[PDB]
Amino acid sequence: NRRDLRDPDRTVIASELVEHSFGVTLDKHVYAALKFTDEQRTLDIRDYTKQVLMP
Amino acid sequence: NRRDLRDPDRTVIASELVEHSFGVTLDKHVYAALKFTDEQRTLDIRDYTKQVLMP
């Protein structure tokens, strides 16, 4: 605030501190699910990392 | 001033040197004031430097 110099009114206006807030939430589950029979894990899958993990 | 050369009258218009002035006044009082109760200072203030002094 501002006031005149040598003003007979010595009153001082107090200022205000107001903090604000917001919220961040964890709300989704992203997943990739696969299932293989033992027959096709033994026989059909050649390179597990290249054929399964990378995709 | 200018006068005609070889003019029958020989009066001269005397010029004036007037110094001017203007005043610069110190006339304002800029302030920021804060009021904290004992409860606000005890419980609501945590730093008081980045929470009161910096604002």
Residues in chain B: 55
Nearest alpha carbon to residue A2 among B31, B25, B34, B35: B31
Resolution of the coordinates, Å: 3.2
Q: Which regions of chain B does DSSP assign to beta strands (E)?
A: 28-30
Can you spell out the DSSP letters for A1-55? -EEETT-S----PPP----------------------HHHHHTT-S-HIIIII--
Q: Which residues contact B1 (CB under 8 A, 6 or more apart)?
A: B12, B13, B15
Q: How far apart are CA B52 and CA B41, in angstroms?
A: 10
Are B29 and A4 in contact by the 8 Å Cβ rule? The answer is yes
Inter-chain residue contact B31 with A14, CB threshold 8 Å? no
Q: How was this structure determined?
A: cryo-EM
For chain A, say whether B45 makes contact (Cβ under 8 Å). no
Q: How close B20 gets to chain A, by Cα (Å)?
A: 27
Nearest alpha carbon to residue B15 among B25, B3, B26, B1: B1
Which of B31, B51, B55 minimises the CB distance to A12? B31
Q: Tokens 């980045």, residue?
A: B50
